[PDB]
Amino acid sequence: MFDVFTRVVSQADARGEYLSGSQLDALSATVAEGNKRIDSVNRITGNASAIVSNAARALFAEQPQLIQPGGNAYTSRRMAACLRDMEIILRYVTYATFTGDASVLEDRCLNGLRETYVALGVPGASVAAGVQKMKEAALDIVNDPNGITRGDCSAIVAEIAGYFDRAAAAVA
Amino acid sequence: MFDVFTRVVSQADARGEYLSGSQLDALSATVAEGNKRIDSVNRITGNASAIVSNAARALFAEQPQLIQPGGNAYTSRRMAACLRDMEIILRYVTYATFTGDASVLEDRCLNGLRETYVALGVPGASVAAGVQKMKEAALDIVNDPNGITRGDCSAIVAEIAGYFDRAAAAVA
Amino acid sequence: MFDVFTRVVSQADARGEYLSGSQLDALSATVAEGNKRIDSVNRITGNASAIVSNAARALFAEQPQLIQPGGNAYTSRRMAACLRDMEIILRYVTYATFTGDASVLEDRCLNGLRETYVALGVPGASVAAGVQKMKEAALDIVNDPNGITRGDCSAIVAEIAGYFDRAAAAVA
Amino acid sequence: AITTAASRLGVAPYNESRPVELRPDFSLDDAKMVIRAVYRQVLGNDYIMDSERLKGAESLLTNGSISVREFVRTVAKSELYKKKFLYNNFQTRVIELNYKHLLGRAPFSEDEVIFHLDLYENQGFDADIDSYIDSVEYQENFGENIVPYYRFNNQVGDRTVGFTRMFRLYRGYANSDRSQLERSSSRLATELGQNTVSAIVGPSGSNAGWAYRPSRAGNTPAKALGGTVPFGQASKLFRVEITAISAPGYPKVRRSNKAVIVPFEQLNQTLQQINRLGGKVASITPASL
Amino acid sequence: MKTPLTEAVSTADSQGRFLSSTELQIAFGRLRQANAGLQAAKALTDNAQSLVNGAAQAVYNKFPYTTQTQGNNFAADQRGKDKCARDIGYYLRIVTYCLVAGGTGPLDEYLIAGIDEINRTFDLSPSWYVEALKYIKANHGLSGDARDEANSYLDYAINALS
Amino acid sequence: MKTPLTEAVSTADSQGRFLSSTELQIAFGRLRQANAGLQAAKALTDNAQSLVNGAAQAVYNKFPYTTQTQGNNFAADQRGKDKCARDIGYYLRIVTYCLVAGGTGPLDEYLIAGIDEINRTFDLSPSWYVEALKYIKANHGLSGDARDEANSYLDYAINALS
Amino acid sequence: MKTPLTEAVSTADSQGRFLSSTELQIAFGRLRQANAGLQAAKALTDNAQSLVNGAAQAVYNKFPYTTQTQGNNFAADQRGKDKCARDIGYYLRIVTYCLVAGGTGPLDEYLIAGIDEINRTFDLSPSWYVEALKYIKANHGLSGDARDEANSYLDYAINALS
Amino acid sequence: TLPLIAYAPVSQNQRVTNYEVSGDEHARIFTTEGTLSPSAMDNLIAAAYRQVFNEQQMIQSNRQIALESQFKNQQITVRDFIRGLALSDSFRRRNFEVNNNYRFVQMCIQRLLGRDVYSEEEKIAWSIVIATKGLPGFINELLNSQEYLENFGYDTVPYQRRRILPQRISGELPFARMPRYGADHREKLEAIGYFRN
């Protein structure tokens, strides 16, 4: 995989030049952003079970056809698999937030997930709605001002939202 | 394609042998069952729209997660394609019943249909369920004693059930 | 195209009326000599190659300028095309005999064939003479009493003669 | 190794992942990580619930009563493995599944399927599973203490058919063997009987044309027999594998996946017609020389 | 129009070959069905006026809103009832034409072609004509081969509208 | 192949339609003459050895140069006589296949397609096979429904060779 | 390429759990030394051409036979000197990539794994590249946090070649 | 090159939407998208021959043996087989050499697009496509044409389109009627010394 540093490293090595000053200043700005990035990772990790359970509640509230006898999330095994899917998508979203590049998300989390969902008959639009609900919960929890030092964090919030959007788009 | 006669003809030509008396007697029995075969074809053809409509209604009743938005039979274009697919599969089942062999059904309908459905994201398990609903509708209409001369027609019903099972097994 | 049934259906729909008793009795009569119609079609189809070869041979016997160097049938390719024209005209006469109506003969064979033979430089009088020789060959073959159930067949013979005369008049 | 196409083919999460080996005096988390790696590999990334967790074999591995090889053997003998892979599959599918799980590679030739199916019918499933475990390849790759792993990289004594058939079996890191496009159909019956190789199509996400599967009949062959001659003036010919054509409709489009051989001069047009159609190009292979 | 004879020729024409014994067996089935079709059409021609009036009354019975709501597409006034009686007359006449022809060709080239956009731009429900064809299928009184081959056209037009 | 059932299904599939009463009449004629085709095929199967030997002898009687001139394509030696008997057995077996099937499809897939390249490559005159088929016509012994059905395939192979 | 962030994510994925406080400390160590790594990479980027030329001359002084005898593996001609300058530029650029990344991942995925087949196949002595990396060690001019981090990658490339 | 000069479309039956059930006078779809018997593949090849070369040039010397063999193996699509029939030597000599560019454009539009030319202006517009790009360039333009595709696509033998309207005994004249050459090549063959008595 790649993080925010090794993505630029791999691009420079494929081009075969040293990093210019603008790339090093952008990486220094990423380093300054890193404390807020680690705060975002810590907050989503600390509220992960609540995010997954509340997003599952909202998803099976507004789409009750999934839990109906015969639905994709019906049966303890299929529901437990759906909850583990929500947990793993949230976990790889935190992984992509931690790295600063999404390469872990396409290389591991979305690498054949659409094949899995098409093969099993999993409705990928329902999974996209679930990832939307985890995005709403995670962006509400990261941007919470209580118990943390103040400062603008719109960049890491937009980056987490982009990770969630490309996670939901790979299955929809 | 093949019918019930040219299947035996092709087997005899691959052997390079004249047809034996057991094969002539079996084909004469097929000729005897042919009027019941034509009755079955006529009944499924005359109730094709009712079979497709009722099977779709029962399918999206017991699996309502496909007509809800984000589902695969959601939108007019998708739902029209699903009804058309049911009509096409039923039409090729009537073709295979007419020929007395599943060559036309396997080669012009079932060949690449699972591949087409997994390429388009169509859930083939749901299409297989709809094929079973068209199966139960068609074998209920064929086995109706009303308005027809009473006689034993269980071989034709089992043969139609075999073609429907071939159609259901080739979409998932 | 029309047949002996759909033609009468076409004038009935043009007048917007049901068929009378006399029209249904005439159609039942056409069903009655339908067996001799199928015999006539079978005999011309079985002896089609002999009819084409013998009539072409007699035509180029009486008209040697076609097979003389420079003639319209003067090559292996142009002779093959002329024999194909004989086969095609005979095929469409059998189609008209099969239907009981020359709508397929006037539609797919005769309309525009005169201008085609004018634009090619094909002598249409020679094609009419060859079609006439096919008429005596086919009518002698149809009226063969051997190897068939005996009965009056002058109506279907006169119908074939009318089709052949209409084919000859379309090119002359 | 695999570097540039590793992200596309899904090799990269296995490229940065080292083989899991249990040390002779191993810690408890080492035993738990061998347990997790065995449940991912041998059970083929299926979700494993707590009811089917096989606590006895885990407990025997945790104190060293059995080795990693014997733990892999035990979880392959188990009813969970048989109901996942054996009882609802063709025997070729079972053979290629055991090759992917226990040996981490696709079956090479037809003779391997011959040997394993004959030994199964002669001696049953457990005897066959033992034959995968008691193979010389298993000892020179994993031995006694290493969990089996997917071997995409070239080793000593492999075949290049196994590289392509590995991606016929491996369909992504986010994917299980039960959750693939051929739901229960063996992917290598026509590849091992005919000794042929289909083009490698990568998994979802990285490859837009991930969903190309060939039909059982009416498939365009890989090599252009004929060359430029049916196409007039041409230089090179390419087989394009096209996925999910649905823009005209059923009368016009009978099959979503289409494979065609097209020249250089028709390549731009072919690409353009795929784009206009909305089709997805799976792979383009040089069909001529 | 679609009919065993015409279809047999069309096949032999597209393959560019003479009428084989396949085509002759097609003609034989046409011949054995044609007498039953002609007698069925004769019976329907005899029972035509009563069947059209009964079918129109059955459509008014199941759909009474056509006889009470004002509009061009409804039969509330005399012109709508005349257009409806003409519609079931057209339906029954083309069914008799299909009986005489021995195929669905009169229905295909006379009524089934373009009936959907007719029903939607003149705001005609196809279910009215479906119920009319149910009355024709219930009150035509035929038996044997004449019954089944007439019903095959009635359900063909039913499946075309529905 | 070309049989009434297969051709009816292929026609209805090309026009994208269900099996109307036209195709039902196609199958009706197929059923009407299928029994006669089967028992004609059985009669030819039982009399096949005598028919092939007599047809070979009739070809050697009409064309004696095949049994006296040296050549690979001629039946002067015993190998050429075995080849001619095998060829006439092939022709008669495909005739029985066509009688069973109900159309010239076994001929079109097994004998007609590619016989010209064989006859011009291996220097086999098609008139020999025409004379063999004329002997099979003159000596099959079938009557009525079986004779006209059998001679349709006999003449179809004759017109394909001529 | 291994890096504290990527190895932390790969490890926590191997246990299949969320990023605990350990990986948060991992990224905090990455943050506290990433600025010094970027500054060292910028200094090496500015001084890279002089460093590569001086390292090439240090190899040519320690190993003068590379500039004297003929051979494809030697720098006796302009082509060999260009290859040596390109190799030392590759080594220095991958060291800058390791400084930016924060680990030996660029070295492992681009230079370290596989260099033994390079040295055996193309008859290149690893002692030449060891002397080159010793020149970058002795002449990069970094201090403190930037010096110790950059010397770690130069030693690791030296340690792999030795 | 140059863009084709604009030509106005003339109303033909294929321009409007077809409100028909296929039935009797439909042109049969000869398609390879369904898996076919070798006999059905042979009738499809004969249908392509009948469309491109007409009935007359269905002789053994005009059969493209290697093209047929590659088409059976599905080395090429139906459109590429139609191209190979149009690029055939027999087609070029019999049809292209005996016609000018205008009548050959009319012939190829009728036998590939399945419709007649709109006017003389369309023949004029595609005749310079012939005159610059050769016959292969012109055929390729016609076979890559959206018309050819939206009508026949890649896997269907072309057919005359909408030749006859429903419930009509007669429609437009069939494409089979058109000869290899017009009256100009007829009178040129008469002037060189043929066809006289």
Ligand SMILES: *[C@H](C)[C@H]1/C(=C/c2[nH]c(/C=C3N=C(/C=C4\NC(=O)C(CC)=C4C)C(C)=C\3CCC(=O)O)c(CCC(=O)O)c2C)NC(=O)[C@@H]1C
């Ligand atoms: C109905 C129960 C389910 C369903 C169906 C659905 N199908 C499509 C699209 C296609 N279906 C086909 C199938 C065939 N090709 C053939 O050759 C044959 C036999 C001759 C068949 C049956 C094809 C080719 C397509 C794509 C082309 C087209 O649009 O017609 C769709 C549309 C998907 C899309 O638009 O991308 C749908 C919705 N969907 C369901 O949810 C039911 C389980």
Ligand SMILES: *[C@H](C)[C@H]1/C(=C/c2[nH]c(/C=C3N=C(/C=C4\NC(=O)C(CC)=C4C)C(C)=C\3CCC(=O)O)c(CCC(=O)O)c2C)NC(=O)[C@@H]1C
């Ligand atoms: C016997 C009547 C006929 C016959 C058989 C024959 N079969 C094979 C080879 C295989 N058969 C199978 C079948 C199965 N695999 C499964 O998993 C199952 C269910 C559990 C079945 C039924 C397989 C997989 C093979 C391939 C392995 C092998 O080669 O043994 C052969 C040999 C194949 C070859 O040609 O090399 C043969 C001969 N052959 C006949 O002529 C009879 C009609």
Ligand SMILES: *[C@H](C)[C@H]1/C(=C/c2[nH]c(/C=C3N=C(/C=C4\NC(=O)C(CC)=C4C)C(C)=C\3CCC(=O)O)c(CCC(=O)O)c2C)NC(=O)[C@@H]1C
């Ligand atoms: C004769 C020595 C042997 C034999 C031959 C046989 N071949 C085929 C079928 C095909 N052969 C080819 C080969 C080519 N087509 C080309 O265009 C070219 C180069 C221009 C080549 C080399 C192809 C493509 C086919 C399939 C397409 C077709 O049928 O034409 C068959 C038919 C097999 C079948 O059952 O379909 C046969 C019998 N068979 C023998 O037994 C001899 C050893």
Ligand SMILES: CCC1=C(C)/C(=C/C2=NC(=C\c3[nH]c(/C=C4\NC(=O)[C@H](C)[C@H]4CC)c(C)c3CCC(=O)O)/C(CCC(=O)O)=C2C)NC1=O
């Ligand atoms: C067929 C196998 C199967 C089982 C067993 C099953 C159980 C199951 N019960 C659930 C919820 C629930 N179950 C309860 C049950 C109770 N609350 C109480 O106070 C009572 C004491 C008690 C009843 C005995 C409640 C309140 C919820 C909702 C939880 C929520 O929305 O957060 C959910 C969450 C999804 C949903 O809302 O539907 C599942 C999956 N689902 C299955 O598919």
Ligand SMILES: CCC1=C(C)/C(=C/C2=NC(=C\c3[nH]c(/C=C4\NC(=O)[C@H](C)[C@H]4CC)c(C)c3CCC(=O)O)/C(CCC(=O)O)=C2C)NC1=O
């Ligand atoms: C191992 C567990 C651990 C963590 C995770 C951690 C994070 C951490 N976050 C910090 C800062 C910060 N964190 C934020 C984050 C935010 N501010 C906001 O108002 C938003 C709601 C939010 C974005 C989610 C900001 C703005 C700073 C100060 C700027 C910076 O230091 O980068 C600091 C600097 C010290 C401080 O001022 O508190 C630390 C150490 N320290 C630890 O020991």
Ligand SMILES: CCC1=C(C)/C(=C/C2=NC(=C\c3[nH]c(/C=C4\NC(=O)[C@H](C)[C@H]4CC)c(C)c3CCC(=O)O)/C(CCC(=O)O)=C2C)NC1=O
């Ligand atoms: C062109 C339209 C047309 C059709 C389709 C047709 C079919 C047809 N079906 C027949 C018989 C029959 N049909 C059946 C069928 C059945 N019996 C049952 O109780 C089951 C519910 C059912 C199976 C679906 C049987 C048992 C016979 C009598 C045996 C036989 O003739 O084969 C007969 C023999 C004559 C008769 O006794 O009625 C005909 C002609 N005739 C026509 O004109």
Ligand SMILES: CCC1=C(C)/C(=C/C2=NC(=C\c3[nH]c(/C=C4\NC(=O)[C@H](C)[C@H]4CC)c(C)c3CCC(=O)O)/C(CCC(=O)O)=C2C)NC1=O
């Ligand atoms: C399906 C209805 C139909 C028919 C029958 C028809 C006839 C027809 N005959 C042709 C040629 C021909 N037709 C003939 C026929 C003859 N030449 C003679 O001298 C004899 C008088 C006569 C034999 C009876 C010949 C020789 C040609 C070859 C002309 C040539 O290619 O130079 C051609 C042009 C050949 C081509 O384009 O490749 C057509 C279209 N067109 C149609 O649409």
Ligand SMILES: CCC1=C(C)/C(=C/C2=NC(=C\c3[nH]c(/C=C4\NC(=O)[C@H](C)[C@H]4CC)c(C)c3CCC(=O)O)/C(CCC(=O)O)=C2C)NC1=O
């Ligand atoms: C599939 C092949 C096949 C065919 C073609 C066929 C035709 C056929 N022609 C018949 C009758 C007949 N065919 C003729 C025809 C003629 N009589 C003459 O003397 C004239 C020379 C000649 C006009 C060409 C007549 C007069 C009848 C009896 C009347 C009738 O049945 O319509 C019959 C009634 C059964 C019989 O008495 O033989 C059949 C089945 N049967 C088959 O199985």
Ligand SMILES: CCC1=C(C)/C(=C/C2=NC(=C\c3[nH]c(/C=C4\NC(=O)[C@H](C)[C@H]4CC)c(C)c3CCC(=O)O)/C(CCC(=O)O)=C2C)NC1=O
């Ligand atoms: C037993 C027979 C056999 C063969 C032949 C074989 C070929 C082979 N070459 C590979 C890679 C490779 N091959 C090359 C080769 C080249 N790159 C270039 O630019 C040059 C044109 C060319 C040298 C002539 C490269 C660069 C890779 C690595 C690709 C990557 O990094 O992803 C791989 C990927 C697996 C791995 O490297 O471990 C295989 C399997 N494998 C086998 O088992």
Ligand SMILES: CCC1=C(C)/C(=C/C2=NC(=C\c3[nH]c(/C=C4\NC(=O)[C@H](C)[C@H]4CC)c(C)c3CCC(=O)O)/C(CCC(=O)O)=C2C)NC1=O
């Ligand atoms: C790389 C990390 C990773 C991912 C992403 C992953 C996904 C994943 N989800 C699966 C199943 C599943 N996923 C779901 C999920 C859902 N069903 C619904 O209706 C909802 C919309 C949704 C939850 C929000 C279900 C129901 C199954 C089981 C399907 C079955 O067995 O029938 C499976 C099949 C194997 C198994 O059951 O364990 C995989 C591999 N696995 C992984 O290792």
